[PDB]
Design a protein around this ligand. Structure first.
Ligand SMILES: N[C@@H](CCC(=O)N[C@@H](CSCc1cccc2ccccc12)C(=O)NCC(=O)O)C(=O)O
Ligand SMILES: N[C@@H](CCC(=O)N[C@@H](CSCc1cccc2ccccc12)C(=O)NCC(=O)O)C(=O)O
Lengths: 244, 244
């Protein structure tokens, strides 16, 4: 088959999807798309995903987006292990519920530090301290609900075994981390779950799945950051503009 | 069975879920939860849904949340018509992709007018003009991507026939409307799809599904609005606080 997977490993959902595929070893044609540069706006990329977003999966002439769908379609088409995306009514619901809450409270809330720290200043824009504080206190606020509301005493957000819910979560939460935010500091229930997930998944994977963002603060300083194209500049300006 | 459905028809997801169930006629014990009042924070409600959010479905001793999950679990358990939540790979993905994008760009963006106009002032807080403008220009921006990116020339966001994607969408979009925003004004592609969905669903349903929010601006003025409990106050304070 060789369905192409256009992503940028600096993008948390992009990561999550890339860990699933490989970990469940799926033939994929990893087509890098430089977000920071603005490749995801190149007229040529827009002929594949009108929205100009990452990651987008091109299977056949069927171009799908949103990691949630991508992963699930992946899991389905590629009959991956059941524990991943269960078939049990109660089961699946628990993932669909998290992925529903994840996109509300986690998504867009745990990637702000990069804009405050790297992307923002990349285009001369400085984010307001208040928004910075407000966002961080907004983070743990999520981390708690994620800590005791979903995780609880069980081993996983979505239940008993690893699930896309955990792949999404842990990836999203890896950004503030790689930036210098140790969110698992005062959270053993959290530090453990993550490490539990990591354990299962494997070092070599996680050790390369991240990398890009782990070094990100460096290239930043060493100004190894590409200058965003006007199209990217816009979206960078919009994003920073919806920081509450 | 008689699984209970705790909701408030002033809450868009609450509506969407309530339209599916009845329209596909499912035994439901509609347990009203006054959001504006703060019943969704009553210690008693919290013993049902720790998060204190609406809607939450109590089937058996299995308490599920997030309309997405609820609806899907509903559809499944209640083997509802296929067109709803397809079984076709390509098919389902298209819903899973929209509901993925819906939660990003539509959810949280199309309910701000109510806070700017009713709920905000309810507790003496006034939202800044900028946030107001910013949000509206942020709406159509969504309306366009929804208009031509998902809808396109086809009859539905998620494909050819009505689907939870359309139930969710149109409901979310009904709030700005009921408040005085005619989002289908300069949008025939949009005005039509909505009316097409409406057609299918039925007046009597939609004529009662909404109502609550349609009258909402009046009770507002005639001060028929209950005074929020301290717990509600907080949440309204937080919400208004994440208005970009
Ligand atoms: N719900 C879908 C949304 C994907 C998404 O928002 N993708 C973001 C990128 S992740 C975030 C991200 C990481 C690293 C560098 C970046 C530089 C510029 C902008 C975002 C960056 C996107 O496409 N953004 C482009 C856009 O929205 O225009 C999903 O989960 O996949
Ligand atoms: N992804 C899930 C989230 C549901 C949700 O956010 N529900 C909101 C209510 S909708 C929005 C809404 C409409 C009318 C009056 C309201 C008064 C106070 C707060 C919100 C109001 C909620 O539970 N909010 C409570 C909370 O988050 O604490 C879904 O789609 O169902």
């Amino acid at each position: 088959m060789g369905l192409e997977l256009f992503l940028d490993l600096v993008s948390q959902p992009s990561r999550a999807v890339y860990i699933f595929a490989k970990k469940n070893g799926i033939p994929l044609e990893l087509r890098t798309v430089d977000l920071v540069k603005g490749q995801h706006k190149s007229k040529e990329f827009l002929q594949i995903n009108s929205l100009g977003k990452l990651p987008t999966l091109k299977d056949g002439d069927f171009i799908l987006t949103e990691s949630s769908a991508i992963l699930i379609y992946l899991s389905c088409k590629y009959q991956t292990p059941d524990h991943w995306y269960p078939s049990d009514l109660q089961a699946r619901a628990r993932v669909h519920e998290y992925l529903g809450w994840h996109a509300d409270c986690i998504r867009g809330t745990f990637g702000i530090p990069l804009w405050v720290q790297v992307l923002g200043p990349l285009i001369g824009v400085q984010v307001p301290e208040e928004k910075v504080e407000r966002n961080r206190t907004a983070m743990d606020q999520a981390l708690q609900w994620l800590e005791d509301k979903f995780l609880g005493d069980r081993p996983f957000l979505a239940g008993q075994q690893v699930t896309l819910a955990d792949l999404m979560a842990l990836e999203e939460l890896m950004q503030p981390v790689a930036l210098g935010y140790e969110l698992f500091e005062g959270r053993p229930r959290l530090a453990a779950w993550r490490g539990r997930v990591e354990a299962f998944l494997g070092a070599e994977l996680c050790q390369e799945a991240h990398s890009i963002i782990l070094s990100i603060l460096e290239q930043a300083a060493k100004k190894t950051l590409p200058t965003p194209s006007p199209e990217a500049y816009q979206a960078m300006l919009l994003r920073i503009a919806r920081i509450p």
